[PDB]
Design a protein around this ligand. Structure first.
Ligand SMILES: [Mg+2]
Ligand SMILES: [Mg+2]
Ligand SMILES: [Mg+2]
Ligand SMILES: [Mg+2]
Lengths: 354, 485, 485, 354
């Protein structure tokens, strides 16, 4: 029957009680040793859908808020997919009314000294690294703004990273190393292109830099194409094969190269080359702004440890409580009828034929 | 003998534990693998898969899911009264819920396990070959804990219940003062079994009978209380080796067939605060009449057929309580002795090496010249060998028994290479004085070790000191209750 | 992207091989585990269990019987055209007989596998984390063999047949002389697939179509001959990926239902001399009429649906013959370059260390005094740091690019400890002259490495030399026959 | 049907053909890749007895000599037991007529240089070690026989080992170390016992020796019991507990102590203490005969390697041929109706109830 397979709760009123759904092998036990008897009920499942199980879940319900605890990985998360697709198909309305949710176990556990922290996302993990890095940090330049910190610094750091992200998003089209150097090199103007002497010396300065900085076995060269409008060209020999990259009139006109220049404009305006960075007790002179940011991060991480979770079973029942099922701590996520739809589709996709 | 007597002698070799450390080949391999790995209690946690592989690879290559289960059971609080494995993650429940994948769960040796394998490096136990013959495994663990009594065993035959460490350490100390003490003199410290899952033992005759003849049948009962607010039965603890979930199914089935009566609501409210089984008595029915009717038809009451069988000398024996205690104390004597002898030998060999190093410094310059002279190390070595070279410090004990009488101060071929091996950092005038300390401190040690080997009552005092250290560090309160009525 | 696009991107990550070394994560882990173990071709055999555990423990903890099967298939002569694993013991048969227990079978890396992972230590490939993050695994193997072509692959999708190494090495060398060569220019060296289990390929259109569009359907037929003494059919070799035992059952079933006719005796005489299937034609029946009737109803004839799909840049691609060859040659260039750069760096760092050691000897006595002076090594160290100390030999290349301009001869903190670390045996006047050789020989090497990195055609000459070394050492005769008719 | 499960042979006449029976997982494959097509047929079995299999074996037979290839270990050898017990029960006469045999794979593989050797037993492994040790060996004593070698030496070595074997067979009753020293110490006579002064000095000499030789932490002591007949007693303190061993009138009268004396008599007659042993190119002076025998064995083993087999699957098909199924090489063993009887009993024993 039902008793022996389900671990019910004291609460008798639906909409005041929540039913957890886990994979026996992953959290079946830990969930039970860490739940709260008052309002948390636990139904372990095993499956790829057991029919007896499917009659147990039906005979179960009662409970208004039903949580699905399952690993994020493709292999383990299947049990979640089978549920969503079974819901959408057999029970459409239950998903629509917002009764079904999806537990969101932390992806990280950061701890500095006595303090520990549970971070949900890789986006939140990024927000946390920036936060630490910046806290207590101030950048002393010789420019109009002797000290750059607080909200102002965050603006800079954000722009700098935004550019490096875009760089990596356009990496296949142009060498990552080159775009990084356009940031430091003076901007090339639509008007500048019309002149050849300025254009040639420019692309010469660029290439001349890349070569001196290159640690890997690569060879940079420059060439200027004459267009009846002068257009620079950067040829790179790597590894044994040389490819050439044209700086089209479009490129110099493109918003992508503008965001690179604007960044360089701010950086060059802040006299970054010569500066001091403190965070926050100590400081060290930096030759570049990125060298200052690398240093910030080296400080922020000095005494902390970071643990990544790959599965629920990695943590004790107590830990599982503090992270996933403690009302105050937990970070749940409700599923939409559009999400159950996608879970039905995925199940069918895996089922090439049936 | 006949091929049948051998085949029976090997099947019994896997099934029975060793009275000395209560471990079967599987457990002893798994634990030794953890120790070699450096998977200590004070080091970071390691994934179960890491250990399971090491075991499968070197000591017990017979299924990954088998080796893991072994580690699992040694981690669970409900199956072992004193866990030998420290585990973080989902390790299964009393309900029978499985443990998480071996790649997710994390484990390291418990503080108590380091005592089980205390003095394992010092040649205190015999070593056997592994399946392929490339590795060596301990024939037994040099244990400071009487595990066979403490944690017990099961035969797929023998059935030994766990016991409180504090009680047992006492009983052991009692056997140490008087070798002739009776089973009733022991039962003054060891009243009975002490299961991890605390419960109530009703009969005291069964345990007295089992400590005396090695065999007996004892009663175990669930700790249930009746509660008002209609009427409800609440179980705080259940009998050892009892699956709580299947227990629940049973009661539900009984009420279905109506073999038991007076139950309206049966729910399992077990949570992070502890175990809690709820049975709401129906109106027109008594709670304790329903309870006793349950005891009579339910796994709530279980008789534990004690059958203490364990391999003493590689041979199966049915032993009473005293026989198990004595065996642990003979094992301690042997480990303690063998330990000393090894410690003494090592001390000798180290003091012998030191003497050469010390003499080298005083005569260092002439040596340095020689080293510069001969192109080949063996040629400079032979030179050091040809001519012999802190007098109060030097004043024969330090010299190993194997060392010849011949070896100014005489040098060994090995010592010549030791002077050649010494690095340039040791040359400093601060290392000389430091080495002088180690040397002198080792003399005081060898002298102490000799005092131990000579005095037979001294050895029995060090053993008693070790047992006490175990009772304090790892001793804890009783959990099951014995109520003879 | 959507959760579905990711879930599909990971399922495809396990299923497809890497064009560069034709290995899937499982194979690359198993092989790397063997290399770390020191399980070389020239060392003693190690039990399979030893490797299986190491793999399960550190790189791929997903079932022991899964990891073993992987090692098995890499050992069998009938499944791999060029075995990457050297195995001693029962490793299963073409019939489908399983391999012996992993505790009985023995294995070590094949000579050819050491080439697959040649230059793996020198930072020639990217490294990824393991499941727990305590170990690092190569993202790909720095292979000298075009395995994806040589040994092929299968998708549970992609289907690539094995190829003769000699042919393929040629085709690679042909692509090296002219980057623009056509698929027909390649087919001058690579006529077609070359299965481990030799057989007859009847159609040549299918292979030409597959080398051109990456997709095609080819015919494979058993090598059967009719024999007199009544009439009997004898099969010497059968189609690749064909279970011989089930083939037999099939023919027996066909004769039962009488879908095929003219067979009185069907026996499997396969033995230590080779494969031998016997089918005795009945009287009043033709042998080759029975044979062709078999081809038509039997697995004796099998069409091999080539479908060359493989992950180029972590992304699935349908590639023709040339695309696969080019990818191997770009991979070689990268490995060769990255190798050099590392070799150069290491040479620099070693020459830099040597310079300090050499200078130490000439000025050795003053140093020795200093060492005697300061009690603490760091105090003697600081002393060495304070004052700077074979001129023709010294005459900047040797110095690493990272080394500052500042560092008489200047010393590094690390170098100070290196002089302090040096042992007394090195002091001999023969070690000085010996070190002088290593130093000078490294200069000639760094100079050579620089010659390589500069000259782009030089690098393409070393690659060609490596391919030739592979064709000679590991090259062998063809086995399957192509008969376009 | 039959084809596909059985690998038959060219030979058609029973009593001219042999059928091998293996465990698929152990040798199923290797057997087939290493057999001889002419007269060797192979039937792999898997099981714990498959019924289809049992109908295949019946439908099989034909073959007069049927071999059972199976590992010796208890776990693997079960398939053999199931066969013998099935034979005895279902087919009594086939075992009685001597049609069933049992392959005997070597337990060892010794190799010196180009030479390799396959040793069947631990008894044969002992005969081989002695053989090597003795070959080229001669013992030079000062006694009436200047040189002791050949047949004469074998006699001595055999007696010496026979005594050490008996010693280990009576080890639990008396300390192994003590009995070894009785060999060197003068014999105690029934007549000697009647005198006390001689008896006391004797047991004093014994104990005094054991103590000087003891490397472990043990303490030897002597005591003489007066019997209204004097009887020596050796008390040993080990580890912290002291046990005492009485040299009863029976002991001195016993054949066991006589074999010890006779050995000592020969050894003492051969002036063993001072001697030379050569085997055979070189030689080294020995203080004892056992020290000479230890040296012999150290020589014999110097360049050889020894591989022990635990399972059939440990060896290649070719190797399996040369060892187990090659008519000339192989070492088979026929089973008696009395052996099948014991295999029936064992099966039943494991089957506590059915
Ligand atoms: Mg076993
Ligand atoms: Mg409680
Ligand atoms: Mg997987
Ligand atoms: Mg052939």
């Amino acid at each position: 029957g039902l008793p022996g397979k389900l671990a019910d709760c004291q609460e008798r009123d639906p909409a005041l009680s929540e039913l957890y759904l886990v994979e026996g092998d992953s959290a079946g036990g830990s969930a039970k040793q860490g739940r709260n008897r008052k309002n948390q009920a636990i139904l372990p499942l095993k499956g790829l859908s057991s029919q007896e199980v499917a009659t147990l879940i039906t005979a179960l319900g009662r409970y208004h808020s039903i949580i699905i605890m399952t690993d994020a990985d493709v292999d383990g998360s299947h049990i979640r997919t089978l549920l969503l697709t079974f819901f959408y198909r057999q029970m459409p309305e239950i998903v629509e009314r917002g009764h079904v949710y999806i537990a969101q176990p932390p992806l990280y556990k950061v701890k500095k000294g006595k303090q520990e922290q549970y971070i949900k996302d890789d986006e939140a993990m990024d927000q946390y690294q920036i936060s630490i890095a910046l806290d207590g940090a101030t950048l002393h330049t010789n420019a109009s703004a002797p000290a750059l910190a607080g909200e102002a610094l965050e603006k800079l750091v954000s722009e700098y990273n935004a550019t490096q992200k875009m760089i990596n998003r356009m990496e296949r089209r142009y060498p990552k190393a080159m775009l990084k150097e356009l940031i430091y090199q003076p901007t090339l103007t639509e008007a500048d292109l019309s002149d050849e002497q300025t254009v040639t010396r420019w692309v010469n300065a660029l290439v001349s830099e890349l070569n001196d900085k290159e640690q890997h076995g690569s060879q940079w060269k420059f060439d200027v194409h004459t267009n009846a409008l002068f257009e620079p060209i950067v040829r790179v020999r790597t590894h044994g094969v040389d490819t050439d990259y044209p700086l089209d009139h479009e490129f110099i006109t493109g918003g992508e190269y503008r965001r690179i220049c604007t960044l360089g404009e701010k950086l060059r305006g802040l006299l970054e080359e010569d500066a001091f960075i403190e965070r926050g007790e100590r400081r060290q002179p930096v030759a570049s702004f990125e060298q200052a940011l690398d240093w910030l991060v080296k400080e922020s991480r000095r005494g902390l440890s970071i643990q990544r979770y790959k599965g629920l079973g990695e943590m004790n029942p107590e830990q599982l409580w503090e992270t996933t099922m403690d009302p105050e701590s937990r970070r749940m996520l409700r599923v939409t009828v559009k999400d159950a739809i996608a879970a039905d589709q995925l199940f069918t996709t895996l089922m090439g034929d049936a | 003998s006949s091929y049948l007597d051998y085949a029976m002698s090997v099947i019994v070799g896997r099934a029975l534990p060793d009275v000395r450390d209560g471990l079967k080949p599987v457990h002893r391999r798994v634990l030794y693998a953890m120790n070699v790995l450096g998977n200590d209690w004070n080091k970071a946690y390691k994934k179960s898969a890491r250990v399971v592989g090491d075991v499968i690879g070197k000591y017990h290559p017979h299924g990954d899911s088998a080796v893991y289960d072994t580690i699992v059971r040694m981690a669970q609080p409900f199956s072992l009264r004193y866990m030998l494995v420290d585990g973080q993650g989902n390790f299964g429940s009393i309900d029978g819920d499985s443990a998480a994948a071996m790649r997710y769960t994390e484990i390291r040796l418990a503080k108590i396990a380091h005592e089980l394998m205390a003095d394992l490096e010092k040649e205190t136990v015999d070593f056997v070959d592994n399946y392929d013959g490339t590795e060596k495994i301990p024939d037994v663990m040099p244990t400071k804990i009487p595990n066979l009594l403490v944690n017990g065993s099961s035969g797929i035959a023998t059935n030994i219940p766990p016991h409180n460490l504090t009680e047992v350490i006492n009983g052991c100390l009692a056997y140490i003062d008087d070798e002739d003490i009776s089973i009733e003199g022991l039962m003054e410290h060891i009243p009975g079994p002490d299961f991890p899952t605390a419960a109530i033992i009703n009969g005291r005759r069964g345990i007295e009978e089992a400590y005396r003849t090695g065999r007996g049948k004892v009663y175990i009962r669930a700790r249930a209380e009746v509660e008002v607010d209609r009427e409800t039965i609440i179980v705080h603890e259940i009998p050892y080796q009892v699956n709580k979930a299947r227990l629940i199914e049973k009661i539900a089935e009984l009420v279905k067939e109506k073999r038991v009566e007076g139950i309206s609501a049966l729910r399992d409210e077990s949570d992070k605060d502890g175990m809690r089984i709820v049975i709401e008595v129906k109106r027109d029915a008594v709670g304790e009449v329903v309870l006793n009717n349950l005891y009579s038809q339910t796994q709530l009451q279980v008789s534990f057929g004690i059958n203490m069988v364990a391999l003493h000398h590689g041979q199966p024996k049915i032993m009473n309580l005293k026989d198990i205690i004595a065996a642990f104390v003979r094992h301690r004597r042997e480990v303690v002795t063998r330990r000393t002898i090894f410690e003494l030998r090592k001390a000798r060999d180290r003091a012998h090496i030191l003497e050469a190093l010390a003499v080298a410094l005083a005569n260092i310059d002439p040596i340095i010249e020689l080293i510069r002279h001969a192109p080949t190390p063996a040629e400079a070595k032979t030179a050091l060998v040809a001519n012999p070279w802190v007098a109060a410090m030097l004043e024969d004990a330090a010299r190993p028994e194997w060392l010849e009488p011949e070896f100014l101060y005489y040098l060994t071929e090995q010592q010549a290479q030791a002077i050649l091996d010494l690095r340039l950092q040791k040359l400093t005038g601060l290392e000389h004085e430091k080495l002088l300390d180690e040397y002198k401190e080792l003399l005081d040690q060898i002298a102490e070790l000799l005092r131990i080997l000579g005095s037979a009552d001294r050895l029995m005092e060090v053993i008693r000191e070790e047992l006490e250290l175990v009772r304090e560090q790892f001793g804890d309160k009783r959990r099951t209750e014995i109520t003879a009525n």
